[PDB]
């Protein structure tokens, strides 16, 4: 039994700012695609080189697996 990380995202035109409150994984989903990011571990991690006007979803979780509910946003133009 344990507490999984909480997180917020805010989306910018070509990057997403991921704010985590704490092996730890930040999963970036686009359509068809899933990228797994490994932050160097309250930190902020920035997913960059993204496409404007595109939907992305983010999930944060510890690996040993409960994937967080996804948080999604639409990047501005
Ligand atoms: Cl790069």
From Swiss-Prot:
Entry PTM: Phosphorylated on tyrosine residues upon interferon binding.
Organs and tissues of expression: Isoform 3 is detected in the urine (at protein level). Expressed in blood cells. Expressed in lymphoblastoid and fibrosarcoma cell lines.
Disulfide bonds: 57-72
Sugar attachment sites: 42
Recorded disease: Immunodeficiency 45: An autosomal recessive disorder characterized by increased susceptibility to viral infection due to impaired antiviral immunity, resulting in infection-associated encephalopathy. Affected individuals are at risk for developing fatal encephalitis after routine measles/mumps/rubella (MMR) vaccination.
Family named by the database record: Belongs to the type II cytokine receptor family.
Summary of the function given for this chain in its UniProt record: Together with IFNAR1, forms the heterodimeric receptor for type I interferons (including interferons alpha, beta, epsilon, omega and kappa). Type I interferon binding activates the JAK-STAT signaling cascade, resulting in transcriptional activation or repression of interferon-regulated genes that encode the effectors of the interferon response. Mechanistically, type I interferon-binding brings the IFNAR1 and IFNAR2 subunits into close proximity with one another, driving their associated Janus kinases (JAKs) (TYK2 bound to IFNAR1 and JAK1 bound to IFNAR2) to cross-phosphorylate one another.
Subunit structure: Heterodimer with IFNAR1; forming the receptor for type I interferon. Interacts with JAK1. Interacts with the transcriptional factors STAT1 and STAT2. Interacts with USP18; indirectly via STAT2, it negatively regulates the assembly of the ternary interferon-IFNAR1-IFNAR2 complex and therefore type I interferon signaling.
Name of protein: Interferon alpha/beta receptor 2
Organism: Homo sapiens (Human)
Chain's gene name: IFNAR2
Shown stretch of the complete protein: 133 to 232 of 515
């Amino acid at each position: 039994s344990f507490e999984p990380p909480e997180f917020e995202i805010v989306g910018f035109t070509n990057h997403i700012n991921v704010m985590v409150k704490f092996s730890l994984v930040i999963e970036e989903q686009s359509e068809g695609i899933v990228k797994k990011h490994k932050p160097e571990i309250n930190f902020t991690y920035i997913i960059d080189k993204l496409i404007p006007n595109t939907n992305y979803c983010v999930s944060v979780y510890l690996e040993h697996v409960i994937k967080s509910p996804l948080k999604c946003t639409l990047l501005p133009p």
